[PDB]
UniProtKB/Swiss-Prot annotation:
Domain statement: The N-terminal domain is essential for RNAP assembly and basal transcription, whereas the C-terminal domain is involved in interaction with transcriptional regulators (such as CRP) and with upstream promoter elements.
Protein name, entry field: DNA-directed RNA polymerase subunit alpha
Role, per record: DNA-dependent RNA polymerase (RNAP) catalyzes the transcription of DNA into RNA using the four ribonucleoside triphosphates as substrates. This subunit plays an important role in subunit assembly since its dimerization is the first step in the sequential assembly of subunits to form the holoenzyme. Part of the processive rRNA transcription and antitermination complex (rrnTAC). The complex forms an RNA-chaperone ring around the RNA exit tunnel of RNAP. It supports rapid transcription and antitermination of rRNA operons, cotranscriptional rRNA folding, and annealing of distal rRNA regions to allow correct ribosome biogenesis.
Protein family: Belongs to the RNA polymerase alpha chain family.
PTM info: (Microbial infection) ADP-ribosylated on both alpha subunits by the phage T4 protein ModA. ADP-ribosylated on only one of the alpha subunits by the phage T4 protein Alt.
Signal peptide: none
Residues of the full protein shown: 110 to 160 of 329
Source organism of this protein record: Escherichia coli (strain K12)
Subunit structure: Homodimer. The RNAP catalytic core consists of 2 alpha, 1 beta, 1 beta' and 1 omega subunit. When a sigma factor is associated with the core the holoenzyme is formed, which can initiate transcription. Both the N- and C-terminus interact with different regions of transcriptional regulator CRP. The rRNA transcription and antitermination complex (rrnTAC) consists of RNAP, NusA, NusB, NusE (rpsJ), NusG, SubB, ribosomal protein S4, DNA and precursor rRNA; S4 is more flexible than other subunits.
DNA sequence: AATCTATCACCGCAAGGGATAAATATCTAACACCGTGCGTGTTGACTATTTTACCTCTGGCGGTGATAATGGTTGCATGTACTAAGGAGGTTGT
């Protein structure tokens, strides 16, 4: 599961093709997800975003 | 190894800061003069440069004293821990 398996739900370049995520094994297998992405320029903890 | 779109940004290209070099004006230094005085020259009399001679220093070193003096000094090698060797000699054994 790879960059060649993405779809662009927004404005996103991808200078990370080699970032393989996971795998599948059968001729009828599947997996799907959404992903949220951000740029900003500073840091906050995942469970101290607070408001 | 070529293609570019789409990053994070350098260029795209306006502004303005310091710089340095021109001209001026000041500084000092380099010099040319002058004057001083010293180390320019020969000569001469001095006195003590050196030599040798003489008369008489310093220090070379050889020589050995006598009322008599006639049993001496010397202090700590080391105190432990080992144990291998030689030394002893009587004897109960080879």
């Amino acid at each position: 599961v790879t960059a060649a398996d993405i779809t662009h739900d927004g404005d996103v370049e991808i200078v990370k093709p080699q970032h393989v995520i996971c795998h599948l094994t059968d001729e009828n297998a599947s997996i799907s997800m959404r992903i949220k992405v951000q740029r900003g320029r500073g840091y906050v903890p995942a469970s101290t975003r607070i408001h």
